[PDB]
């Protein structure tokens, strides 16, 4: 089962946004093997922000 299509337009836009925010200065622990829990974390913080 798959939840996140990483190449779909709004998800790949979010992907490009955090890749650019990485490549501008720096962030924490690295990438290229993602997790769906991090996607749920991002979407839950977006839920709290919209609320």
């Amino acid at each position, epitope marked *: 089962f798959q939840l996140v299509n990483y190449t779909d337009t709004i998800p790949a836009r979010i992907m*490009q946004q955090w*890749r*650019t925010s*990485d*490549s*501008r*200065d*720096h*962030t*924490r622990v*690295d*990438w*290229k093997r993602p997790k769906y829990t991090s996607a749920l974390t991002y979407d839950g913080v977006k839920v709290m922000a919209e609320a």
Partner: single-chain antibody, 229 residues
Framework: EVKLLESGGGLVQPGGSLKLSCAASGFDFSEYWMSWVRQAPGKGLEWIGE????????DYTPSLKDKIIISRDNAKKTLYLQLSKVRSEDTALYYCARPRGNYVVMDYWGQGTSVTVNIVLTQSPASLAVSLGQRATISCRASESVDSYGSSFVHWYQQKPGQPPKLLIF???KLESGVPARFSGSGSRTDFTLTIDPVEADDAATYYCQQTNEDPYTFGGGTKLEIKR
């Protein structure tokens, strides 16, 4: 593995145009960002610019915008740098590199090509001679606080004469892939320290510690390593 090869360098007349290509192999250039950085002969490095995979935002320095153009090709996985109206300051070594600000583990710099027409990071010492099989120590002092969110975003690289600076140590506590277990890093918030154990003969180069925590992204002064015999 990750491999980058630059081509098109050499000599160029003053006032003309120049196009340098950089081919990649072993990774996906259509997702990973690219960067280009110049280095004068005998001086420190200087970041020319960076470009994303989708070719939507290409950033550069504010003082070299009218003479640099960065493009890329994800189908051929090759980056292209175009320079117009070259001057006497254009005689330098350019270097194409993978995303170094983005991913510290996937940080890798290509060989580059030679073209012939406040945070203060102090290295310690300027020059030292260590024998083979020993352990050398190189210190670095920062004028401002480079610590952010618990991690010290400082990279330690080694550049030789004719060889590009390979990213040896990332984030002051992790060793890069491909390099053997012969270099470690430590320090705290004003003083960083790179240790080499054991000392080999091929490690005789110039070590540089560079921090990119905030603007401006400075580079180290350069500390040469001499192998005793």
């Amino acid at each position: 593995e990750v491999k980058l090869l630059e081509s098109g360098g050499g000599l160029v007349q003053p006032g003309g145009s120049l196009k340098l290509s950089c081919a990649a192999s072993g990774f996906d250039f259509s997702e990973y960002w690219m960067s280009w950085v110049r280095q004068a002969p005998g001086k420190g490095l200087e970041w020319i610019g960076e470009i994303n995979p989708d070719s939507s935002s290409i950033d550069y320095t504010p003082s070299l915008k009218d003479k640099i153009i960065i493009s890329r090709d994800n189908a051929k996985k090759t980056l292209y740098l175009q320079l117009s109206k070259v001057r006497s300051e254009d005689t330098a070594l350019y270097y194409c590199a993978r995303p170094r600000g983005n991913y510290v583990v996937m940080d890798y710099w290509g060989q580059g090509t030679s073209v012939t027409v406040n945070i203060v990071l102090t290295q310690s010492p300027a020059s030292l001679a260590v024998s083979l099989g020993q352990r050398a120590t190189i210190s670095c002092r920062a004028s401002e606080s480079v610590d952010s969110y618990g991690s010290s975003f400082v990279h330690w690289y080694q550049q030789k004469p004719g060889q590009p600076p390979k990213l040896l140590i990332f984030l002051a506590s992790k060793l890069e892939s491909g390099v053997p277990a012969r270099f470690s890093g430590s320090g705290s918030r004003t003083d960083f320290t790179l240790t080499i154990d054991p000392v080999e003969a091929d490690d005789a180069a110039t070590y540089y510690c560079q921090q990119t925590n905030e603007d401006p992204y400075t580079f180290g002064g350069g500390t040469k390593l001499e192998i005793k015999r």
